[PDB]
């Protein structure tokens with residue numbers, strides 16, 4: 441039944457190593473990572489916050505709390521997915537700990553405000569560096585991807601012992617807010633609230649100039665940004681841009697959207713080129729996280745997706761363009777909406793979770809990429825685990841083989857006292873059982889090969905030919921064929937350690 445084994449990973453507290461590079465909660469974590477392996481979890485995932493390590497200065501890396509944390513993990517026998525977290529913790533949902541980007545970068549920003557994504561009003565979003573300064577050498581003679589690449593080269597030099605023994609199996613290079621390839625279009629920070637459409641975050645002078653230069657390239661210098669796209673909390677109908685047969689379909693608006701959405705491809709391309717020549721040769725896999733912007737999916741404009749950077753429509757696959765860019769790099773997609781079901785989203789959201797999971801996992805599987813998921817919200821119900829299991833093996837168990845399509849692995853959000861305690865614990869455990877096709881945990885499964893080098897760079901126009909025509913999804917079963925059962929599952933009822 442091994443072909444059907446899907447690895448489960450838990451995501452560690454946002455603060456596995458505390459708010460100032462001091463690994464503190466080690467004994468708690470030691471007890472918390474004890475039950476997780478009794479549950480049979482394959483490995484864990486932590487952020488390697490850029491603001492904690494090079495916080496103190498240019499190239500002043502302090503891997504100390506982090507060498508100790510991974511020490512704990514290795515000792516627990518767990519695989520580790522590390523997230524190269526070049527973004528601020530605090531601002532999004534579920535962000536309790538608050539870790540900003542490096543103070544010395546934020547100080548550069550004081551001098552040049554345009555280094556942070558800027559909305560139409562001119563509000564500076566401090567949580568991630570605009571993709572416009574990727575190749576702008578203004579961080580004291582270092583450009584942002586130089587900075588991103590030196591941060592990852594240093595991670596390799598210092599974490600080598602873990603990279604050799606095979607504890608670190610996946611590097612997830614973050615490329616935007618929450619470490620996701622996208623724009624900060626729905627910033628709870630700036631008074632956006634779900635299911636609002638969000639805004640186009642492309643007003644800083646670097647992108648503000650990439651576009652005017654791009655406008656004149658196609659003969660239209662005169663062209664500006666969408667005047668009619670509304671505000672954060674509007675609904676499509678309310679704006680002239682996202683309204684049925686609105687400017688999102690006009691030449692000016694198709695071009696804009698092509699630009700805006702291409703910038704994210706390119707950003708992610710550049711930085712992945714580098715993460716690939718850094719980890720080049722390692723038994724690791726490179727991944728990126730793509731948001732799950734399900735609200736306004738059921739409407740024609742797909743507004744929230746268009747503002748977030750994913751130019752997805754009924755006739756244009758905006759998630760297969762992205763996966764085509766990941767293809768050279770032998771990268772994989774890490775999508776985040778797996779636990780939802782259309783049933784549970786507010787009816788006015790015009791949200792289609794299930795249909796977004798099917799689109800992205802299908803674009804990815806079509807591009808030959810390994811796809812993996814992560815739930816977007818705190819969920820401890822069997823419903824959540826069965827929806828996940830459905831999405832893991834769309835077509836279900838193929839005991840007569842390995843299945844057509846299968847997720848490489850799932851990474852549950854998040855480790856808490858509540859997950860490893862009682863009821864929630866026996867559900868999670870039986871969930872893991874089932875995610876492994878009820879086989880016992882196997883660590884010598886899905887062994888990676890030394891990361892090859894990124895293949896030949898391919899133009900924008902060559903990655904963009906995957907958009908058209910949008911293909912049909914891969915037939916998804918409606919429920920999983922190996923659900924949670926109910927409360928219990930194989931061993932019974934497990935009872936043990938609290939917290940202190």
Ligand SMILES: OC[C@H]1O[C@H](O[C@H]2[C@H](O)[C@@H](O)[C@H](O)O[C@@H]2CO)[C@H](O)[C@@H](O)[C@@H]1O
Pocket residue numbers: 451454486487523525527528529530532533534535617618619620729776777814815816817
């Ligand atoms: O631990 C990883 C990141 O967790 C949060 O971001 C999550 C977000 O809460 C969730 O809705 C989405 O599905 O995935 C992201 C990215 O994994 C923090 O906000 C991030 O700062 C962390 O990097």
Ligand SMILES: OC[C@H]1O[C@@H](O)[C@H](O)[C@@H](O)[C@@H]1O
Pocket residue numbers: 532533626628634816
């Ligand atoms: O902050 C972003 C989050 O907002 C929530 O209200 C939605 O339910 C989530 O799908 C989304 O990820």
